[PDB]
């Protein structure tokens, strides 16, 4: 019973951890892409001269 | 503004990327270790209970 | 420029040069606990060799580093702004004198 | 100028704080190892407190206790960070200056994890459990029929 | 006496001493965890103010 | 002449409004993380309101919450914008003149 | 953040994997030998009793 | 929508997985113990009768 | 967190910067006038006839 008590507070719920990791990876790829496009935001300024 | 010296959008994107990466880091640590409460900074009282 | 007749207490300007502070040597503790009015201030020896109730001295370090840096910033910014204003006024004088010459 | 100073001083302050996280992480890891040592000590202490074990098995148990306590003291005296004995008997709290316009800090308040400060200091299950005495006091000297002879003699 | 040590003689309540040590260690560990939380929150706040 | 005065003053007013936008951004950003502090405090209050936690762990929760409150106070005191503690104890409403003709 | 010269996540994953493999090794040794008290580093007084 | 921060489908799947896992645990416990009324929380009156 | 040696290196860098500031003061010259220096009286800049 005490081992179950420890599991209820200490062991990680794999089902939610996998989903959290997946969403984190998705956010990472999206962030890298949007950061790139933000880096080409000032490029349009380098058209008129 | 059409200025190039500083890019506020790039800075905001960097911040959100860092937040997502920190979430990924804690998720990866909890996935690898198999313990939700390690590095007590998450659920400090929980580690005392455990 | 010093005065012998009038002295200054630790916190005040008192004519009485000497107070006869009362300290008790705490037996088995070897610490000169205060007795007169502080009543256990745990006297420490100051940097000048006299007895005092403080524990930590000034040391040897810029006590307010960033505040002094901000003061330097303010002085430099004031001078730079004054020079810029004089420069703008001088440019206006250039324009006015050129017009008057014409 | 004011904004440049503030923004880049805040970047430097972020660097200082981020070093603070690393310091706390190292100290927390050392404390976790001490925690595992205490867990093992408690397990084998519950084992040794049984009366069925003869004296020599208690001697072996105490040998393992001494090894664990020595390792705890080693962790205390050897956990280093930037040449600072962070988890030792001489470790004043840190400052971690965060933000420009100094006057605000983040006190760490980390110190005193070792034997003789976790309270064990003599932990023993058998005969061999040598503890520590205290410096004799002048009050004690007088108490046991002290007779003065001179300057504290 | 002169020598600084003496026999321990079967430390009275072992598990109570161990539990006191556990309480002290867990208190300090929880303080450090709280400091880590505060410090990462400061990191986020300072980054926001920097931007 | 009147048109130049109006256009130049109104452009400067646009700059002033931009300064106000930036100040609002800083204040909102600081408040956004004070929000996370309050969220964590609420979550841990829910956790520690349980009776299964003995006094030592409630003390640990209280210590962490004390850290959170001290951090909120630090945010209030240290949040600065052009030498103005905008989100602090002494923060009067600003003016932000937009348009000429005071 | 976006640093690559050190991968802290890889390090913690490796450490946790090493702990898991140590547990697996102890379990495998106990299974093959059939003795819980083997390699006196495990239950030192236990092997004295045995 | 097209959101990524929250995945409602994943949460629903996790909940159904938890319910199925609880049912499986009860089934395994009943098989291993061999008594339908064990851990009295189920059929408390049945426990009193037994 | 910085020990004494790193603080000493920081102080060396700060001393270098201060020496540069002092150098800029002593050597910023304009027509033989150390304009941004410790001996720089305000100038006149006669602008116009009828002195």
Numbering used by the authors:
A (entry chain X): 510 to 558
B (entry chain X), G (entry chain j), H (entry chain u): 2 to 51
C (entry chain n): 408 to 509
D (entry chain f): 52 to 204
E (entry chain f): 459 to 509
F (entry chain T): 52 to 153
I (entry chain n): 103 to 153
What does the paper say about this structure?
MFA1 R437,38, a soil bacterium that was identified as a cell culture contaminant. However, there are four flagellins in the Achromobacter ASU, with two up and two down conformations. This tetrameric symmetry is characterized by two 4-start helices that occur at different radii. The ODS surrounding the EHEC H7 and Achromobacter flagellar filaments produces an intermediate waveform that is not adopted by the “canonical” S. typhimurium and E. coli K-12 H48 flagellar filaments.
Here, we show the atomic cryo-electron microscopy structures for flagellar filaments from enterohemorrhagic Escherichia coli O157:H7, enteropathogenic E. coli O127:H6, Achromobacter, and Sinorhizobium meliloti, where the outer domains dimerize or tetramerize to form either a sheath or a screw-like surface. A shared feature in all four structures is the formation of symmetrical homodimers between the outer domains of flagellin subunits, with one outer domain rotated 180° relative to the other. These symmetrical dimers are the result of outer domains being able to adopt either an “up” or “down” conformation.
